[PDB]
Amino acid sequence: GRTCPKPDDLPFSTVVPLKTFYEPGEEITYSCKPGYVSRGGMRKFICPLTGLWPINTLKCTPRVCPFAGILENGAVRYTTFEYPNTISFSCNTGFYLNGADSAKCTEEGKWSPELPVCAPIICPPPSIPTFATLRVYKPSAGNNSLYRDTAVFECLPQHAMFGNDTITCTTHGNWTKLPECREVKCPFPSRPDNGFVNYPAKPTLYYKDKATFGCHDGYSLDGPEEIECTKLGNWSAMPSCKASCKVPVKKATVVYQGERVKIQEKFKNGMLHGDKVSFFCKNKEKKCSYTEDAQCIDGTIEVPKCFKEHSWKTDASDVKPC
Ligand SMILES: *[C@@H]1O[C@H](CO)[C@@H](O[C@@H]2O[C@H](CO)[C@@H](O[C@@H]3O[C@H](CO[C@H]4O[C@H](CO)[C@@H](O)[C@H](O)[C@@H]4O[C@@H]4O[C@H](CO)[C@@H](O)[C@H](O)[C@H]4NC(C)=O)[C@@H](O)[C@H](O[C@H]4O[C@H](CO)[C@@H](O)[C@H](O)[C@@H]4O[C@@H]4O[C@H](CO)[C@@H](O[C@@H]5O[C@H](CO)[C@@H](O)[C@H](O)[C@@H]5O)[C@H](O)[C@H]4NC(C)=O)[C@@H]3O)[C@H](O)[C@H]2NC(C)=O)[C@H](O)[C@H]1NC(C)=O
Ligand SMILES: *[C@@H]1O[C@H](CO)[C@@H](O[C@@H]2O[C@H](CO)[C@@H](O[C@@H]3O[C@H](CO[C@H]4O[C@H](CO)[C@@H](O)[C@H](O)[C@@H]4O[C@@H]4O[C@H](CO)[C@@H](O)[C@H](O)[C@H]4NC(C)=O)[C@@H](O)[C@H](O[C@H]4O[C@H](CO)[C@@H](O)[C@H](O)[C@@H]4O[C@@H]4O[C@H](CO)[C@@H](O[C@H]5O[C@H](CO)[C@@H](O)[C@H](O)[C@@H]5O)[C@H](O)[C@H]4NC(C)=O)[C@@H]3O)[C@H](O)[C@H]2NC(C)=O)[C@H](O)[C@H]1NC(C)=O
Ligand SMILES: *[C@@H]1O[C@H](CO)[C@@H](O[C@@H]2O[C@H](CO)[C@@H](O[C@H]3O[C@H](CO[C@H]4O[C@H](CO)[C@@H](O)[C@H](O)[C@@H]4O)[C@@H](O)[C@H](O[C@@H]4O[C@H](CO)[C@@H](O)[C@H](O)[C@@H]4O)[C@@H]3O)[C@H](O)[C@H]2NC(C)=O)[C@H](O)[C@H]1NC(C)=O
Ligand SMILES: *[C@@H]1O[C@H](CO)[C@@H](O[C@@H]2O[C@H](CO)[C@@H](O)[C@H](O)[C@H]2NC(C)=O)[C@H](O)[C@H]1NC(C)=O
């Protein structure tokens, strides 16, 4: 007689027993694959005398895991919440992921691992270094600090901080490197020849202590009036007193700091150590005028050879430039 032929392969299903032909009266069973379900479940069929498998209503669809698109204080990456898909998690700034960063919809239609949670990153109160106080610190969570909170140390008087005064609460719930505070001392500074030095009346001199210098008349400082004890045990500078120069000529228009001046007028009480000036000289060939420089160095200034002071003719200073 007739036989039923090989049964149709339906999506996400298996047939048992699967043969290429069946005698009338034999049974087959469609089941959905693991991870899938159908309206009606298993369909059984018996090969009829006609050899025609009847019509199969079985539609197998993925198990759907419970909705997981919202992570408080974070983000979920997903397409669909159905077997066998994966979803990823990450947290907003200042939170850490408390749990696995991904989960799968199992053939049983639950999440594996369990869904995680975002929690606030926190550090405990930080430690004071030795010979330091805590200027800026107030807990922002209980008595703990939140991510990217800061604390600031100042050293004790006579102490230089090596490192940095500001620590930050890290992702790892620990703070950044603490700075060190050490006592630092400087020598007494030397009185300069032709000058004097003032510093405070005490036996040892410490970090951030100041000395001031001065000069006798006809002398001026070749560096700053004020110096301090640096963190490296020395001084900012050690200035000397140097001789002023007498005006090297009687009358001359010169450049001083980009601007023409009468050297007689500008330097009536002499020139200080370092005062630079430019005299005007004539190029007799091209009947035009150039400058050369001249500096007061410790009571000496060399007026250029090319310069000619005029005791009716024209001064270099009054001639067109070259
Ligand atoms: C807050 O809490 C946090 C939580 O733990 C703390 O975070 C930790 O920070 C510490 C370091 O302070 C971490 O430990 C250390 O890890 C160092 C780096 O390891 C990487 O390199 C290793 C190379 O062997 C390798 O094993 C790792 O795989 C790792 O690599 C990387 O992978 C990532 C991806 O995941 C990539 O993105 C990276 O690019 C990749 N990097 C590399 C290099 O591959 C490690 O070096 C360090 O070791 C020192 O201390 C050990 C103490 O026991 C000691 O045993 C070690 O020998 C080493 O020391 C030194 O030895 C090394 C050589 O091994 C010397 O280096 C060289 O010198 C050569 C000259 O001959 C030269 O040729 C080379 O170029 C090189 O310069 C080095 O000089 C030696 N130093 C000294 C002083 O002797 C240590 O294992 C820890 O893992 C972190 N944990 C976390 C969770 O982050 C944090 O510290 C806390 N903060 C505070 C403020 O307390
Ligand atoms: C910043 O962060 C800091 C650091 O954390 C934080 O400072 C902490 O501040 C808290 C509170 O300010 C301190 O806490 C606890 O204080 C207890 C005193 O009081 C209680 O009584 C008053 C009465 O008016 C009541 O109002 C309180 O709510 C509280 O009592 C409660 O009692 C009811 C009863 O009806 C219970 O239902 C509640 O559970 C209970 N509530 C609480 C919160 O406890 C003080 O006695 C406690 O001391 C504990 O825990 C300490 C942990 O370090 C531990 O050192 C102590 O030794 C003690 O633990 C005792 O442990 C014994 C065993 O080891 C146990 O022995 C017996 O009991 C059982 C029987 O079943 C057996 O073990 C045994 O057989 C034996 O019989 C004791 O019972 C047990 N004692 C208690 C009382 O449970 C708490 O400290 C913190 O101490 C303090 N921490 C530090 C480090 O300073 C600060 O608040 C934060 N700042 C800010 C702004 O948030
Ligand atoms: C108060 O205190 C201290 C003295 O106790 C003074 O600190 C000294 O300052 C100098 C320069 O300001 C520094 O030394 C050297 O720094 C530079 C750069 O150094 C880097 O590069 C070198 C490679 O050359 C490498 O090792 C490192 O990467 C390093 O970071 C150098 O160019 C220079 O190095 C040499 O100095 C030698 C003289 O000692 C010469 O022979 C060399 O030809 C070359 O110039 C420089 O000296 C240090 O920070 C420090 N030195 C020491 C010995 O402690 C500070 O200046 C002083 N201040 C005042 C205001 O008086
Ligand atoms: C101590 O070190 C910190 C960390 O490097 C410095 O902070 C940085 O400051 C600069 C300019 O102020 C910024 O561009 C950076 O973004 C800061 N980094 C961080 C992690 O905050 C700080 O300036 C240093 N303190 C001193 C006194 O030098």
Q: Is cis: bond before 17, omega within 30 of 0?
A: yes
Q: Which two tokens stand for residue 301?
A: 């200034």
Residues near ligand 3 (Cβ within 6 A): 230, 232, 234, 236
Final residue before a domain boundary, out of 183, 200, 218: 183
Rounded CA separation 234/212 (Å): 15
C-alpha 138: how far from chain center: 24
Residue 248 neighbours by CB under 8 Å, 6+ apart: 263, 294, 301, 303
Q: What range does the domain containing 280 cover?
A: 244-321
Rounded CA separation 151/126 (Å): 8
Q: Is cis: bond before 200, omega within 30 of 0?
A: no
| Total Cβ atoms within 10 A of residue 132 | 19
Residue 143 neighbours by CB under 8 Å, 6+ apart: 125
Final residue before a domain boundary, out of 102, 121, 140: 121
- Cβ pair 199, 205 in contact under 8 A: yes
Q: Are residues 144 and 194 in the same domain?
A: no
Q: Are residues 194 and 237 in the same domain?
A: yes
Between the CA of 219 and the centroid of ligand 1 the distance, in Å, is: 59
Q: Are residues 166 and 126 in the same domain?
A: yes
What phi and psi, each to the nearest 5 degrees, are found at residue 204? -130, 145
Q: Are residues 29 and 9 in the same domain?
A: yes
Between the CA of 169 and the centroid of ligand 4 the distance, in Å, is: 14
Which residues is 213 bridged to in the sheet? 197
Rounded CA separation 278/190 (Å): 35
Residue 163 neighbours by CB under 8 Å, 6+ apart: 177, 178, 179, 180
Atom of ligand 1 nearest to the CA of 177: 99
170 lines ligand 4 (CB under 6 A): no
Determination technique for this entry: X-ray
Residue 154 neighbours by CB under 8 Å, 6+ apart: 132, 133, 135, 161, 165
Final residue before a domain boundary, out of 205, 224, 243: 243
Q: Is cis: bond before 84, omega within 30 of 0?
A: yes
Ligand number nearest to the C-alpha of 174: 1
User: How would you write 249-269 as a 3-class SS string?
Assistant: CCCCEEEECCEEEEHHHHCCC
Closest residue by Cα to residue 152 from 121, 179, 130: 179
Between the CA of 142 and the centroid of ligand 2 the distance, in Å, is: 17
Rounded CA separation 273/297 (Å): 5
Q: Which two tokens stand for residue 147?
A: 């991510």
Protein residue whose Cα sits closest to atom 21 of ligand 4: 168
* Residue 1 DSSP class: -
Question: What is the CATH number for 139?
Answer: 2.10.70.10
Q: Are residues 151 and 97 in the same domain?
A: no
Q: Which two tokens stand for residue 235?
A: 């001084």
- Resolution of the determined structure in angstroms stands at 2.6
Ligand number nearest to the C-alpha of 138: 2
Which residues is 289 bridged to in the sheet? 282, 321
Structurally, the chain folds into a number of domains equal to 5
Protein residue whose Cα sits closest to atom 20 of ligand 4: 168
Q: Are residues 271 and 300 in the same domain?
A: yes
